């Protein structure tokens, strides 16, 4: 009779559409008694959620069936990109609902991706009716954002130059880009709009002029900051393409895979070694900028 829609918005998020994620939806109807309580729908929601999908996965393909019309079939959703939207991570089901009494529910499980990310989904528990709070109506379109986190961090120095008199300063206008080494060959971090929380890269006969490759530049403070650009674990490299006049190099950035070791200590980004302070979020600080660490040193004397 009535029909509703259910729209997954799949996202990376750091504690961002990302496309292949994969579900089963199951006609859940049975799972629900007639003249249920709220607290009880709630009960029930909360029970499926703290199962692992494995766990939930072991239920509903014993006892429930496949329902809902996805866009892999009944009960099977693929994330896309959606042109009716302009967004990545897009997927939308339709199911035959009951607006009036909570007779009709759908368990949603994500499933193995198509063929550096942890993919933290729950077994969600849609019970019809969804009440709009804003206009009492209940709701014809469902929007989940289940979780993904990716792990990325967020480098950063001071280039200093130095004075045979042994004076120093901040400087400005060094130019800067990423590299990594591949197969014995360098590929630069490039301009293009991050895809599923993960960087482009390209090789490049001139990295200083080709407009393809991300420049950094160091600013009256002497940062050189990657700012909205992140980097995943690994090995990287500042590669120096115009050094500031008068103090004319690769500077390694090592990233560690994790925030925490074993014993909950804080694991460093090494900037040539040198361990670099870093919040959450990975913005560069004014109490940070002041401190001037990590920094490079750039000698005038040839
Ligand atoms: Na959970
Ligand atoms: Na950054
Ligand atoms: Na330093």
Do not use: C
């Amino acid at each position: 009779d009535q029909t509703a829609e259910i729209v997954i918005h799949k996202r990376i998020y750091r504690d961002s559409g990302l496309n292949g994620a994969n579900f089963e939806v199951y006609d859940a109807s049975s799972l629900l008694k007639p003249n249920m309580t709220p607290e009880a729908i709630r009960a029930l929601v909360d029970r499926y959620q703290n199962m692992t999908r494995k766990q939930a996965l072991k239920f509903a393909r014993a006892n429930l069936k496949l329902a809902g019309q996805g866009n892999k079939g009944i009960g099977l959703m693929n994330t896309k990109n959606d042109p009716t939207l302009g967004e990545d991570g897009i997927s939308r089901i339709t199911v035959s609902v009951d607006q009036q009494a909570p007779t009709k529910a759908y368990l949603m499980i994500e499933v193995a991706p198509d063929p550096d990310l942890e993919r933290k989904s729950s077994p969600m528990l849609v019970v019809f009716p969804v009440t709009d709070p804003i206009s009492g109506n209940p709701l014809q379109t469902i929007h989940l954002y289940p979780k993904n986190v990716g792990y990325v961090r967020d480098p950063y120095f001071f280039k200093f130059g130095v004075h045979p008199d042994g004076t120093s300063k901040r400087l400005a206008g060094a130019i800067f880009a990423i590299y990594r080494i591949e197969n014995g060959k360098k590929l630069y971090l490039d301009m293009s709009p991050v895809t599923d929380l993960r960087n482009k890269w390209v090789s490049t006969t001139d990295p200083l002029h080709d407009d393809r490759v991300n420049k950094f530049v160091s600013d009256q403070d002497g940062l050189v900051n990657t700012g909205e650009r992140f980097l995943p674990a690994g090995e990287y490299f500042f590669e120096e393409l115009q050094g500031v006049p008068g103090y004319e190099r690769a500077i390694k950035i090592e990233i560690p895979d994790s925030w925490e070791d074993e014993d909950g200590n804080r694991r460093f980004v090494l900037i040539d070694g040198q361990p670099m302070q870093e919040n959450f979020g990975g913005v560069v600080t004014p109490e940070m900028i002041s401190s001037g660490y990590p920094r490079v040193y750039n000698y005038a004397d040839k």
